[PDB]
Design an enzyme around this catalytic site. Structure first.
Site, PDB file in Angstrom:
ATOM      1  CG  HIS A  62      39.129  37.915  49.151  1.00  0.00           C
ATOM      2  ND1 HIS A  62      39.210  38.933  50.077  1.00  0.00           N
ATOM      3  CD2 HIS A  62      38.336  36.969  49.702  1.00  0.00           C
ATOM      4  CE1 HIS A  62      38.472  38.624  51.127  1.00  0.00           C
ATOM      5  NE2 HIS A  62      37.927  37.443  50.920  1.00  0.00           N
ATOM      6  CG  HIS A  92      42.358  32.592  42.037  1.00  0.00           C
ATOM      7  ND1 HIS A  92      42.848  31.394  42.513  1.00  0.00           N
ATOM      8  CD2 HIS A  92      43.284  33.529  42.349  1.00  0.00           C
ATOM      9  CE1 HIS A  92      44.020  31.599  43.089  1.00  0.00           C
ATOM     10  NE2 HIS A  92      44.307  32.886  43.003  1.00  0.00           N
ATOM     11  CG  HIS A  94      45.579  37.681  41.699  1.00  0.00           C
ATOM     12  ND1 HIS A  94      45.205  37.938  43.001  1.00  0.00           N
ATOM     13  CD2 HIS A  94      45.895  36.365  41.648  1.00  0.00           C
ATOM     14  CE1 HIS A  94      45.293  36.823  43.707  1.00  0.00           C
ATOM     15  NE2 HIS A  94      45.708  35.856  42.909  1.00  0.00           N
ATOM     16  CD  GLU A 104      48.655  38.065  43.400  1.00  0.00           C
ATOM     17  OE1 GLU A 104      48.767  36.825  43.482  1.00  0.00           O
ATOM     18  OE2 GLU A 104      48.201  38.781  44.317  1.00  0.00           O
ATOM     19  CG  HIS A 117      47.491  32.744  40.642  1.00  0.00           C
ATOM     20  ND1 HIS A 117      47.518  33.604  41.720  1.00  0.00           N
ATOM     21  CD2 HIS A 117      48.544  33.087  39.863  1.00  0.00           C
ATOM     22  CE1 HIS A 117      48.541  34.431  41.597  1.00  0.00           C
ATOM     23  NE2 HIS A 117      49.180  34.139  40.479  1.00  0.00           N
ATOM     24  CB  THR A 196      49.606  36.017  46.297  1.00  0.00           C
ATOM     25  OG1 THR A 196      48.318  35.749  45.739  1.00  0.00           O
ATOM     26  CG2 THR A 196      50.679  35.279  45.500  1.00  0.00           C
ATOM     27  CB  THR A 197      45.221  36.088  49.388  1.00  0.00           C
ATOM     28  OG1 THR A 197      44.803  34.730  49.579  1.00  0.00           O
ATOM     29  CG2 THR A 197      45.227  36.406  47.900  1.00  0.00           C
TER      30      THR A 197
END
Ligand SMILES: NS(=O)(=O)c1ccc(NC(=O)c2ccccc2S)cc1
Ligand SMILES: [Cl-]
Ligand SMILES: [Zn+2]
Length: 257
Positions: A62, A92, A94, A104, A117, A196-197
């Site tokens: 992901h 990590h 995004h 995000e 993040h 958020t996941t």
């Protein structure tokens, strides 16, 4: 049929396996800078990463996680809207398939090229596992990335990605200093939200910095060479691994400035 970011398993499908997706405090959200209110009750934010100890980097299918040893009181986030000490466990990003999207959270609807993040868990809960069972179990420090000048401190991460191209791959990644990923100002917006996941747990106090860091086109381009798939499987580039803004509902975003 695992959750992902595709048309048949993307964000709009998550609620089926994770009903909390339509919850009351979901993340990310759009940050309306004009509606955000300065909160004088906020204490100075403290980011102490001098003793941070990274251990490994992993492609989880992901995104990629730079994990830290959180068995001791090192690398902690405190102050601001936080009560107590939160310990860094991993960070990590995004990002998008294009520079025009990837973040995000959004600021006045503006999407940045990516979003960093830094995940921390509330030390009063013993560990990460128990923390994600609490309303205030986590604190995520979000930092926007825009394409411009390179970020010297991010290059070591960029250069190890070739070794964890596919899902499930990990590599040793010690002595990485996250202080090299922080912008000058610690001005921020804060609000109660969620992961958020999936599992999209609502245990997060979000602290999103106003000042984004600049990264080079070359650096983000390498993020885009990663794969969502595992080794030997058809290549699906790891891009646009972000969830769109969710309903703010009964929440107020506070500003530290
Ligand atoms: N993107 S985020 O909101 O910063 C975020 C942070 C942590 C997780 N963590 C998990 O999903 C997780 C849950 C249990 C065990 C391991 C993990 S990596 C997901 C999103
Ligand atoms: Cl696809
Ligand atoms: Zn994230």
């Amino acid at each position: 049929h695992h959750w992902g970011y595709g048309k048949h398993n993307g964000p709009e499908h998550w609620h089926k396996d994770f009903p909390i997706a339509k919850g009351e405090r979901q993340s990310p959200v759009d940050i309306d800078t004009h509606t955000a209110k300065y909160d004088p009750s906020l204490k100075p934010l403290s980011v102490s990463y001098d003793q941070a100890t990274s251990l490994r980097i992993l492609n989880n299918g992901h995104a990629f996680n730079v994990e830290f040893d959180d068995s001791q009181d090192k690398a902690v986030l405190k102050g601001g809207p936080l009560d107590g000490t939160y310990r860094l466990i991993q960070f990590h990003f995004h990002w998008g398939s294009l520079d025009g999207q990837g973040s995000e959270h959004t600021v006045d609807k503006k999407k940045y090229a990516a979003e960093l993040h830094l995940v921390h868990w509330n030390t009063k809960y013993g560990d990460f596992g128990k923390a994600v069972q609490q309303p205030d179990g986590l604190a995520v420090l979000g930092i926007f990335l825009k394409v411009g000048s390179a970020k010297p401190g991010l290059q070591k991460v960029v250069d190890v990605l070739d070794s964890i191209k596919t899902k499930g791959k990990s590599a040793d990644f010690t002595n990485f200093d996250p202080r090299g990923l922080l912008p000058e100002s610690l001005d921020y917006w804060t609000y109660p939200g969620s992961l958020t996941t999936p599992p999209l747990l609502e245990c997060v106090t979000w602290i999103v910095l106003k000042e984004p860091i600049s990264v080079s086109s070359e650096q983000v381009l390498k993020f885009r060479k990663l794969n969502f798939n595992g080794e030997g499987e058809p290549e699906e580039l790891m891009v646009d691994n972000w969830r769109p803004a969710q309903p703010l509902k009964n929440r107020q975003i506070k500003a530290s400035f």
